[model samples]
Target: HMILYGTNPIAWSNDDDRSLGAHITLDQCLDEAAKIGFDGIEKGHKFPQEAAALKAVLEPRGLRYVSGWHSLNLLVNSVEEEKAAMQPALDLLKAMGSKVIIVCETSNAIHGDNDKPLQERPVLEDARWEAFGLGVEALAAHAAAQGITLVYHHHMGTIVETEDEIDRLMRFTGPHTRLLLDTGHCLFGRGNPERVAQKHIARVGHIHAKNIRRDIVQDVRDQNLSFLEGVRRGVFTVPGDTEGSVDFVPVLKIAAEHGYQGWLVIEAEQDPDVRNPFEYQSLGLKSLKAFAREAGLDK
Candidate 1:
């Protein structure tokens, strides 16, 4: 079977700043997402925590749960503690029949700090590598036992942002610690998304079809701006936007060759006011499908 398509709600309502899309209700967002023809949608701040309530919201629109981000602090917290913290989301994913859990190591992360510049993001020191790696492996093992794979997201303003860091992460953690490849971040962070996809498709549990505005990223870096500031300045966009820099065809082709059967989520976060979620997301869905077809992945 071909990949199932999904979109994140951040485009409609940002979790970091609720003020961004305050005008759009959860019902309106979900309805528009369903109308745009996504097979599923990722979790967001507005999503109900309870399984039944969330099901009532999604199932009626024929949208499945494609997984959500879980901020992991295993760099400082114990694996057991992290597992306990993750249980609720894990339970929600299980109840919704989602197979993977998206994770980003947020310990000392600067992604959410609007005032913190991107250059100030935390780094995983060599002295703590073993502990962090072991912790992730243990958590991955625990998640695997529960029939949910832990997909590590290489996000900007996090320790694992660069290609070298990603390679080191993959080397340190076992196969259980799967990767969630995000095209936009990979490109913005100056890593090759196509190369990463080609090299790590076997370990890729999920994919994010995000695209970045190259000029905007250049401006962000040149000015040493904050992550949220870059986001506010339109650093991220849906895959189909004409200004997008990343190409999905090669990445999708690599995934198809690797027999990757997972959710391809459109996860570009931008101001909904400036870039309408409906129009941008619809264009994204169409672009990804077109790229898939070109890759010979849409069978």
Candidate 2:
């Protein structure tokens, strides 16, 4: 009986108006998520990161806040600047009564050159790992004071992507910090999700049940395609879609066996302009239900 959730980034795009081709508002996103059978949703930048707006939308759907992602410049050359950037997100999380805050270290030339392609970024050596650890420790301290938990997200195109890097991050970070285990990003980043969950289940405070196509991964790695290009080519999909590559059975089993009872959020980056958001979400929900049944969760 894990609480299944959905991420707003799947349907909402990041822009001034928060419009992802269609005029999908935060309330609409919540409606769509609940309609698709999700129990909660990850707060995206599209939604007013404010408490009032978030509550207005969430209270109606009976949806809880699974987590909120903060794309902070943690890798920036100036630690002060990075801390300043993270403050608003932290404050917002406190106001919303959320427990988990997803941390993403965006690339900046000051800390390390971002001009280089994905494969060419500097390797996360011991020293850099220490810096990342320090940053996490600072944020985790703040989060603890505010009664929130910081969950580092190992995302593609970011410094912490692969299994080794994830392991290093978990080792370097303090005990208070947790992980928001994203299944699609782990596979895309060349890591096994089931193994990660099995090994680090205690540290995983949240989970995103994203699925990806292996062929798209090969194409992106071999042909040097962009992330958007990979998405366009069907590299990622909702939980139940067989058209894509990811298989959720093993990972779900591991999480269940390990007593990981966090939210299972369906996160996909499909362009709503091309595909109908409602239809994709509905299909994803149906698939999630079937998967739950197979996992012996739906009694």
Candidate 3:
């Protein structure tokens, strides 16, 4: 399997909370990502929606618009409504030459809520699972028709937050409903990401190579802190950080063995003030390259 190292701009600037890295400019973010030797960058709030405008900046920096997040509200909207609403995002990715679309159902997600505790995250009842699954499967097929894979993000404060939830979601939907396995969220949400990768290797369409501060996670939970609050307290970090929780070797090995050829995005949502984005991202890319080489995914 070939590897393309990428990073998310959330490391440089937080989209949920503009106050996190408001001092940084989009140009500085792009320049640092390019200088760090990354091949692509995931979309952020700071990025322009216009493909031409994004390209004007990204092309000059030797970076590709890899993919971006799209919050889906399937619980409130019908499948057709979502399909129509998703067009602009899909068109942007298509125009940017990206092959995947990162999505998470946020109709009741609390990740953006600063006061909502993690334990209070929205839960989908057994009765609603079928409808949710149907909607997701339809959206997946819709994205597939456009030559873009819709990879669902199993987030911390979302309905599909746990490994069991992930398993259930995977089983409920068709094969078209793929996964965006984020390492940090998998671990923080109380599951081993390597095991998840092993169980859903074939369904894995994209990777978020994020690591966590294992030491701080439980405390955050115990203290009843919100997801964004935990982020503010620095619960997430790059894969190479000494305080990181997840190990990339086995995960990379599993992906490579399964012939997974896609982006391993380094997405650590941390305060740039505490952990310099450039330093952490550079370390993340370098360490992930080493791990991939060791896993026989890279040379």
Count of clashing pairs, candidate 1: 0
Model 1 score (lDDT): 0.90
**Residue pairs in candidate 3 whose N, alpha carbon or C atoms collide under 3 angstroms:** none
RMSD (Cα, Å) of candidate 2?
Answer: 3.4
Better of 2 and 3 by lDDT: 3
The local distance difference test score of each candidate is 0.90, 0.71, 0.92
The total of clashing pairs for model 3 equals 0
Worst 10 residues of 3 by lDDT: 1-10
Over the stretch 10-64, how does candidate 1's per-residue lDDT look in tens digits? 9999988778898889999899999999999999999998999999999999999
lDDT of 3 by residue, 1-299 (tens): 36789999999999998999999999999999999999999999999999889999999999989999998989998788899989999999999999999999998899999989999998899798888888899999999999999999999999999999999889888879899999999999998899999999999999999999987897798899999999988899887789887988999899989999889999989989988999999999999999989998785
What candidate 2 gets wrong by more than 4 Å, as runs, is 1-4, 14-23, 77-84, 109-117, 296-299
| Model 2 Cα shift for residue 275 (angstroms) | 3.0
Q: Give Cα distance to truth, residue 270, candidate 1, Å.
A: 0.9
Error of 2 at 287 (Å): 2.1
Q: On residues 123-160, what C-alpha lDDT tens digit does candidate 2 reach at each position?
A: 56667788878887677777777778888888777778
Number of the candidate with higher TM-score, 1 or 2: 1
Better candidate number, 1 or 3, judged by lDDT: 3
